[PDB]
Scaffold this motif. Structure first.
Motif, PDB file in Angstrom:
ATOM      1  N   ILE A 165      13.834   7.878   5.506  1.00 45.45           N
ATOM      2  CA  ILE A 165      12.668   8.266   5.396  1.00 45.45           C
ATOM      3  C   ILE A 165      12.671   9.592   4.213  1.00 45.45           C
ATOM      4  CG2 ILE A 165      10.610   9.638   6.120  1.00 45.45           C
ATOM      5  CD1 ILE A 165      10.767   8.107   8.627  1.00 45.45           C
ATOM      6  N   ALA A 166      13.424  10.279   4.506  1.00 44.98           N
ATOM      7  CA  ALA A 166      13.741  11.384   3.411  1.00 44.98           C
ATOM      8  C   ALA A 166      13.997  11.130   1.896  1.00 44.98           C
ATOM      9  CB  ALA A 166      14.750  12.574   3.955  1.00 44.98           C
ATOM     10  N   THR A 167      14.848  10.019   2.093  1.00 45.93           N
ATOM     11  CA  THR A 167      15.122   9.122   0.733  1.00 45.93           C
ATOM     12  C   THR A 167      14.205   8.291  -0.063  1.00 45.93           C
ATOM     13  OG1 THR A 167      17.221   8.917   1.644  1.00 45.93           O
ATOM     14  CG2 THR A 167      17.039   7.692  -0.486  1.00 45.93           C
ATOM     15  N   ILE A 168      13.614   7.546   0.947  1.00 49.55           N
ATOM     16  CA  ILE A 168      12.481   6.569   0.458  1.00 49.55           C
ATOM     17  C   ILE A 168      11.334   7.263   0.301  1.00 49.55           C
ATOM     18  CG2 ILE A 168      10.673   4.761   1.067  1.00 49.55           C
ATOM     19  CD1 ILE A 168      13.542   3.743  -0.263  1.00 49.55           C
ATOM     20  N   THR A 169      10.536   8.310   0.985  1.00 47.21           N
ATOM     21  CA  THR A 169       9.570   9.186   0.611  1.00 47.21           C
ATOM     22  C   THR A 169       9.502   9.907  -0.863  1.00 47.21           C
ATOM     23  OG1 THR A 169      10.041  10.748   2.238  1.00 47.21           O
ATOM     24  CG2 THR A 169       8.727   9.272   3.081  1.00 47.21           C
ATOM     25  N   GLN A 170      10.726   9.796  -1.289  1.00 44.96           N
ATOM     26  CA  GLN A 170      10.822  10.713  -2.521  1.00 44.96           C
ATOM     27  C   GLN A 170       9.782   9.965  -3.753  1.00 44.96           C
ATOM     28  OE1 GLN A 170      14.956  12.766  -3.625  1.00 44.96           O
ATOM     29  NE2 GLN A 170      15.066  10.644  -3.075  1.00 44.96           N
ATOM     30  N   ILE A 171       9.413   8.708  -3.422  1.00 41.05           N
ATOM     31  CA  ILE A 171       8.700   7.958  -4.221  1.00 41.05           C
ATOM     32  C   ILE A 171       7.207   8.151  -3.784  1.00 41.05           C
ATOM     33  CG2 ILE A 171       8.073   5.411  -5.013  1.00 41.05           C
ATOM     34  CD1 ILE A 171      10.988   4.543  -4.115  1.00 41.05           C
ATOM     35  N   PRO A 172       6.481   8.954  -4.380  1.00 42.45           N
ATOM     36  CA  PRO A 172       5.392   9.273  -4.322  1.00 42.45           C
ATOM     37  C   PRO A 172       4.434   8.427  -3.316  1.00 42.45           C
ATOM     38  CG  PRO A 172       5.821  10.181  -6.487  1.00 42.45           C
ATOM     39  CD  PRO A 172       6.610   9.010  -6.095  1.00 42.45           C
ATOM     40  N   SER A 173       4.239   6.884  -3.718  1.00 46.48           N
ATOM     41  CA  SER A 173       3.410   6.137  -3.185  1.00 46.48           C
ATOM     42  C   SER A 173       3.927   5.683  -1.845  1.00 46.48           C
ATOM     43  CB  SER A 173       3.541   4.915  -4.166  1.00 46.48           C
ATOM     44  OG  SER A 173       4.708   4.440  -4.358  1.00 46.48           O
ATOM     45  N   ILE A 174       5.084   6.031  -1.518  1.00 40.67           N
ATOM     46  CA  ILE A 174       5.489   5.808  -0.087  1.00 40.67           C
ATOM     47  C   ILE A 174       5.226   6.949   0.900  1.00 40.67           C
ATOM     48  CG2 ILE A 174       7.207   4.650   1.440  1.00 40.67           C
ATOM     49  CD1 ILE A 174       8.180   3.487  -1.163  1.00 40.67           C
ATOM     50  N   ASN A 175       4.542   6.724   2.047  1.00 43.23           N
ATOM     51  CA  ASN A 175       4.443   7.696   3.337  1.00 43.23           C
ATOM     52  C   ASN A 175       5.002   7.318   4.321  1.00 43.23           C
ATOM     53  OD1 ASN A 175       3.012   9.464   1.305  1.00 43.23           O
ATOM     54  ND2 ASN A 175       0.984   8.662   2.030  1.00 43.23           N
ATOM     55  N   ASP A 182       0.877  -1.110  -0.105  1.00 42.26           N
ATOM     56  CA  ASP A 182      -0.142   0.051   0.077  1.00 42.26           C
ATOM     57  C   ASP A 182       0.937   1.292   0.084  1.00 42.26           C
ATOM     58  OD1 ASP A 182      -2.041   2.177   0.120  1.00 42.26           O
ATOM     59  OD2 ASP A 182      -3.100   1.301   2.030  1.00 42.26           O
ATOM     60  N   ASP A 183       0.984   1.959   1.088  1.00 41.28           N
ATOM     61  CA  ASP A 183       1.906   2.957   1.031  1.00 41.28           C
ATOM     62  C   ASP A 183       2.922   3.051   2.096  1.00 41.28           C
ATOM     63  OD1 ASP A 183       0.354   3.251   3.422  1.00 41.28           O
ATOM     64  OD2 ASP A 183       0.169   5.196   3.520  1.00 41.28           O
ATOM     65  N   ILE A 184       3.443   1.792   2.405  1.00 44.88           N
ATOM     66  CA  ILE A 184       4.256   1.604   3.322  1.00 44.88           C
ATOM     67  C   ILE A 184       5.622   0.803   2.716  1.00 44.88           C
ATOM     68  CG2 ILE A 184       5.118   0.293   5.552  1.00 44.88           C
ATOM     69  CD1 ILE A 184       2.073   0.459   6.406  1.00 44.88           C
ATOM     70  N   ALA A 185       6.732   1.194   2.944  1.00 42.67           N
ATOM     71  CA  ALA A 185       8.053   0.410   2.483  1.00 42.67           C
ATOM     72  C   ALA A 185       8.427  -0.472   3.282  1.00 42.67           C
ATOM     73  CB  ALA A 185       8.958   1.569   1.835  1.00 42.67           C
ATOM     74  N   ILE A 186       8.442  -1.817   3.001  1.00 42.93           N
ATOM     75  CA  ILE A 186       8.904  -2.656   4.134  1.00 42.93           C
ATOM     76  C   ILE A 186      10.448  -3.053   3.737  1.00 42.93           C
ATOM     77  CG2 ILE A 186       8.799  -5.184   5.152  1.00 42.93           C
ATOM     78  CD1 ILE A 186       6.039  -5.141   3.734  1.00 42.93           C
ATOM     79  N   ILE A 187      11.188  -2.401   4.565  1.00 39.86           N
ATOM     80  CA  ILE A 187      12.623  -2.412   4.326  1.00 39.86           C
ATOM     81  C   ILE A 187      13.293  -3.585   5.327  1.00 39.86           C
ATOM     82  CG2 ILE A 187      14.794  -1.370   4.081  1.00 39.86           C
ATOM     83  CD1 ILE A 187      13.232   1.544   4.092  1.00 39.86           C
ATOM     84  N   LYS A 243       6.770  -0.559  14.735  1.00 40.56           N
ATOM     85  CA  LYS A 243       5.727  -0.589  13.902  1.00 40.56           C
ATOM     86  C   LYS A 243       5.960   0.344  12.649  1.00 40.56           C
ATOM     87  CE  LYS A 243       2.664  -0.923  18.150  1.00 40.56           C
ATOM     88  NZ  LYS A 243       1.715  -0.293  18.725  1.00 40.56           N
ATOM     89  N   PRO A 244       5.290   0.327  11.580  1.00 39.44           N
ATOM     90  CA  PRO A 244       5.327   1.585  10.437  1.00 39.44           C
ATOM     91  C   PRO A 244       5.546   2.902  10.932  1.00 39.44           C
ATOM     92  CG  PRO A 244       3.804  -0.173   9.702  1.00 39.44           C
ATOM     93  CD  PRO A 244       4.051  -0.311  11.321  1.00 39.44           C
ATOM     94  N   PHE A 245       6.277   3.811  10.229  1.00 40.49           N
ATOM     95  CA  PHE A 245       6.216   5.167  10.883  1.00 40.49           C
ATOM     96  C   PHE A 245       6.688   6.025   9.790  1.00 40.49           C
ATOM     97  CE2 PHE A 245      11.147   5.541  11.048  1.00 40.49           C
ATOM     98  CZ  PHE A 245      11.439   4.149  11.177  1.00 40.49           C
ATOM     99  N   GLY A 246       6.529   7.196   9.811  1.00 46.71           N
ATOM    100  CA  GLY A 246       6.587   8.395   9.003  1.00 46.71           C
ATOM    101  C   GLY A 246       7.452   9.307   9.516  1.00 46.71           C
ATOM    102  N   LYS A 247       7.806  10.587   8.762  1.00 47.94           N
ATOM    103  CA  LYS A 247       8.739  11.599   9.534  1.00 47.94           C
ATOM    104  C   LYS A 247       8.159  12.174  10.661  1.00 47.94           C
ATOM    105  CE  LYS A 247      11.682  13.622   7.558  1.00 47.94           C
ATOM    106  NZ  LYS A 247      13.241  13.128   7.313  1.00 47.94           N
TER     107      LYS A 247
END
Ligand SMILES: [Mg+2]
Ligand SMILES: [Mg+2]
Lengths: 143, 146, 146, 143
Positions: free
Chosen positions: B102-112, B74-79, B134-138
């Protein structure tokens, strides 16, 4: 004298949460010859002009499942409706008609007819369509 | 309309389909290349390689770290990283690492958001000062401090 | 107009730019991601992984083979493999391998030929029956038999 | 209330063999705020309407080298033409004008003016522009 590889995008349903409808692209790469061949087979299934005297070569309800070109062979995948009882003269016209129509695409020299993604012994009829074949091979495939 | 950067590319992989030793033959096997996943994967690999020696920047992950897998749900990047990513870090260094990913990966619009895993499993922290259970954003970074 | 499948993507990698231990800071380092190279690289990696065990196809390269680097110079794909790629092969198997790589890679419109290298250097052959000393396309395969 | 990230493609010269001219895309990702801010600074450099009574705040020959938004700071990179001898009253109006114009973009609270990609002590003048600054910081930057 061709179209060559064509970069095309298909938009399908990429909605999951059902609040906001969303479409996502799926890119595909096809050569012009498959698109053209596919159009031709679809045109044969639609049949001849009602304003003319020609007769159809495949049942009207026949559906083209897929069309692919492997080297110089055109894999024409039809539905179950294509298999009906035919006279040897009618069935021979059908196979010659498909070949004459498809071999107009220079890259194609033979056709391999499949039904429901699977190999079949015959559409009609008296003709063996178990393997790929060209115009020359038709008389040798009678049974 | 979805704002995927590259989107899916439906292609084929040609493997050996030979039977008759007289005629070599290749048969297709379909591969749906998910562009955003391959791009994201490349970016994470690039972060692990580290900054240019010709610059003044410092690395955010150990050099021996290995990317096990990268997937976008979905909008989560599983690294998914290897055990080498877990080391002792200061809270300021660990915070830069998480903000950098986060700053690097969130460049991909589909990822928040990002969900970091180690050896295909969940982990409490990389450095010791931040909760990555758990998942997290900026926005969530300050709230995950432990 | 160029028919590159994905094309270049100009982005940033965020590394650690901290000086003051009080404030964690990240600074950008530019990365020009060449889409066709990342896609091509993914495809070659996919070929090395081999066909699905649920199918009937056979591999075209040894499983222990490693992709050292992948680069696109004009219309040539420089596929740099490790020493594990060089093994004894029959002329029919080796021909399927070269045709499989070409068929897979030439899906990327910008590529018309491949240049296989081993350990960043030129090689006469992978299997022993084909000359891969220079770049080659599908048409050139029969002419390279030795 | 924004535009958000914008996927844009730039077509540059990808010709090498000089027989067939070819262009290749270079994708870029920018938020609407940088595009808008960039437009605003460009508008300030163009100057006020000739049909009005207002005076310019930057030299007409000034060129915007680049505009970037780092967190809440607008990095306004100008050319050497922006540095001229100014009175403290004129220079203060310039800095207040840039800030008042740029801070209209909510994400921006401070500006960092650079000249030729490098840090500078002052444009005019009596004002220290060595570090980022907002409206409140102007009186404290007099020298
Ligand atoms: Mg996906
Ligand atoms: Mg390139």
């Amino acid at each position: 004298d061709l179209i060559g590889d064509i970069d095309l995008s298909l938009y399908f349903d990429g909605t999951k949460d059902e609040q906001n409808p969303k479409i996502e692209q799926q890119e595909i790469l096809v050569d012009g010859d498959e698109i053209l061949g596919q159009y031709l087979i679809q045109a044969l299934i639609q049949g001849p002009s009602q304003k003319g005297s020609l007769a159809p070569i495949l049942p009207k309800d026949t559906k083209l499942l897929s069309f692919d070109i492997k080297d110089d062979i055109a894999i024409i995948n039809l539905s179950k409706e294509a298999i009906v009882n035919m006279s040897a003269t009618k069935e021979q016209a059908t196979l010659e008609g498909i070949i004459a129509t498809i071999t107009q695409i220079p890259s194609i020299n033979k056709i391999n007819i499949l039904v429901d993604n699977q190999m079949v012994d015959s559409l009609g009829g008296n003709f063996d369509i178990s393997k790929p074949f060209g115009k020359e091979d038709i008389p040798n495939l009678k049974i």
